[PDB]
Amino acid sequence: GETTDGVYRVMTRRLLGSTQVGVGVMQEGVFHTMWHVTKGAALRSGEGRLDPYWGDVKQDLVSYCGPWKLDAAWDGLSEVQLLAVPPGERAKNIQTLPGIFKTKDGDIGAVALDYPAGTSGSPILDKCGRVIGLYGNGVVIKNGSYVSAITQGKRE
Amino acid sequence: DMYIERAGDITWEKDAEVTGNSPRLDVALDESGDFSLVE
Numbered sequence: 689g690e691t692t693d694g695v696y697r698v699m700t701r702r703l704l705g706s707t708q709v710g711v712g713v714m715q716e717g718v719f720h721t722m723w724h725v726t727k728g729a730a731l732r733s734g735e736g737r738l739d740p741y742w743g744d745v746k747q748d749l750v751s752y753c754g755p756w757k758l759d760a761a762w763d764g765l766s767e768v769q770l771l772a773v774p775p776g777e778r779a780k781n782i783q784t785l786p787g788i789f790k791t792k793d794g795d796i797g798a799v800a801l802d803y804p805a806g807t808s809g810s811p812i813l814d815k816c817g818r819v820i821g822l823y824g825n826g827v828v829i830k831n832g833s834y835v836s837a838i839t840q841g842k843r844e
Numbered sequence: 845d846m847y848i849e850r851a852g853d854i855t856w857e858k859d860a861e862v863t864g865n866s867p868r869l870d871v872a873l874d875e876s877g878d879f880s881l882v883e
């Protein structure tokens with residue numbers, strides 16, 4: 689299968705036609721996506737199979753073929769880019785200044801950009817092109833707008 | 845059986861479209877990985 693670094697669509701043929709259920713990042717031979725996209729199930733890349741390696745429902749993350757490799761973090765000050773890969777549409781970079789999710793266990797950056805559910809797993813990048821987290825786990829606020837956490841894993 | 849298809853390189857784009865606000869929200873994260881607004 690394709691092992692080249694980059695952003696990929698996660699598709700299924702189990703619903704009507706071919707449907708995009710999410711997105712993920714291939715880096716250092718490991719595929720990274722959000723748990724809610726695949727529910728930890730195995731994936732196909734051409735004729736090759738990608739088996740789950742690590743996952744956590746509370747973090748809402750999963751890696752395939754190896755351990756989670758993404759370790760860059762939002763600096764808390766600078767604008768970032770969401771590399772949105774929406775269903776049926778070309779990959780497009782959107783620049784924004786994150787907001788913050790404040791929790792009892794600490795603060796996390798958050799991006800206030802609204803895209804269809806099948807965009808979940810799209811990467812958020814810093815100015816060096818490093819992936820600082822994945823888009824698609826968040827909340828709906830007072831005015832009806834969606835705000836995603838910048839969800840990042842831990843490189844062991 | 846889910847399958848993956850490449851959609852692009854991961855790179856910062858100069859002069860990309862700039863949008864979105866920066867809300868500061870109090871939130872809670874449950875054992876099922878769902879966030880909720882705390883008010």
Ligand SMILES: Oc1ccccc1CNc1nc2ccccc2[nH]1
Pocket residue numbers: 700702703709710724725726805806808846
């Ligand atoms: O993908 C998502 C994006 C946002 C919210 C929820 C989900 C989960 N839905 C889902 N339906 C599927 C059907 C076949 C294979 C994978 C699937 N994932």
Ligand SMILES: Oc1ccccc1CNc1nc2ccccc2[nH]1
Pocket residue numbers: 774802803804805
């Ligand atoms: O965005 C949504 C969020 C939640 C539910 C439904 C939609 C559909 N609307 C929509 N807005 C877009 C903006 C850019 C690309 C594709 C888009 N699709």
